[PDB]
């Protein structure tokens, strides 16, 4: 019972000494919560085995792991991820991330890197026979030039070859959704999980958006999460913070994302700690110099057994 519709953001930037020779984005540590799993590295195979049964737990069957280019070719933490996910059913996607001099021939390039290296794994992910890729901060990039690479007619098009895809860009605001067509990109996610930190991230304006997806043939995927605090390496971000509120703030934003319509759904974040976007498991922690926000009164994994509550909400809706 993994569904393939629902797809979490996750980040496998992680390490330290144990595992990698030092501290990675840890680095008492970067976030306002604490992992049950401490301080771990995305390079732990029995990190990776827990991180997959969490899904597992979470019914969430696809993840989308951050990606940033060259640099990450042939990178440990991803095959350790898909053999993993293969064990079990679930499903790997690659979030393209604003890496050094991204553009639409260096987003190919590394398109062609994934389906070439991973393509054929039995966990890659498809979904009406396409791989699917999220692209971040995609909007760096002017419209006109992505169609070089997203349209059938493009210099660099990527249509009608084996590296033809479904390729999502990241929107703003509700009235740029046309630069989405001109793009030719295939459709459009949120990400930020604090509601209205966007016009795109205001779950009142979901139904609407979703609406012009159909009309446009575009796939809508809102991003939901649990809440958003950053506050320990952002002292100044105060008003992106959304407090948890005991569950209730991730279960109006995630039947936001249900009653829109939306026929994928998308989780910010599985693991983004620094954002404090997390679903994954956080214990309570006090410790010298700062006392970390946990999830009391509710259960360490309660993110995860809640988002199954609503898979479930999401899977019989999209069966009628």
């Not at 205001?202 to 991003?223: E, G």
């Not at 998308?266 to 693991?271: K, L, Q």
């Not at 995860?304 to 019989?316: C, G, H, P, Q, S």
Request: proline share 5%; with cysteine.
């Amino acid at each position: 019972t993994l569904d393939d519709h629902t797809i979490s953001f996750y980040y496998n930037w992680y390490g330290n000494p144990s595992v990698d020779g030092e501290m990675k984005h840890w680095m008492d540590i970067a976030c306002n919560f604490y992992p049950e799993l401490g301080t771990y590295s995305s390079n732990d195979p029995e990190i990776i085995r827990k991180h997959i049964r969490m899904h597992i737990k979470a019914n969430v069957g696809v993840l989308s792991v951050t990606w940033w280019g060259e640099s990450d070719y042939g990178n440990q933490s991803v095959s350790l991820l898909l053999d993993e996910a293969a064990k079990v059913g679930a499903k790997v996607c690659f979030h393209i991330e604003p890496f050094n001099g991204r553009s639409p021939q260096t987003v190919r390039e590394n398109i062609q890197y994934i389906v070439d290296t991973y393509g054929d794994h039995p966990a890659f992910y498809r979904t009406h026979g396409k791989p699917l890729f999220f692209i971040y901060d995609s909007y760096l990039i002017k419209p006109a030039e992505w169609a070089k690479l997203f349209a059938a007619g493009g210099e660099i098009s990527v249509r009608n070859t084996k590296y033809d895809g479904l390729f999502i860009g990241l929107t703003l605001k509700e009235s740029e959704l046309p630069d989405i067509e001109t793009a030719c990109m295939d459709g459009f996610y949120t990400y930020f999980a604090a509601t209205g930190f966007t016009n795109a991230s205001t779950p009142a304006n979901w139904k609407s958006m979703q609406q012009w997806a159909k009309a446009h043939n575009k796939l809508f995927i809102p991003s939901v999460g649990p809440g958003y605090i950053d506050t320990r390496i952002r002292p100044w971000n105060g008003s992106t913070t959304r407090d948890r509120e005991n569950g209730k703030y991730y279960d109006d934003m995630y039947k936001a994302a249900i009653e829109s319509g939306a026929s994928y759904i998308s989780i910010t974040s599985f693991n983004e700690w620094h954002e404090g976007t997390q679903i994954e498991p956080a214990v309570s922690k006090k410790c010298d110099a700062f006392e970390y926000l946990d999830y009391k009164p509710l259960a360490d994994d309660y993110y995860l057994i809640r988002t199954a509550y609503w898979v479930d909400e999401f899977r019989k809706a999209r069966s009628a």
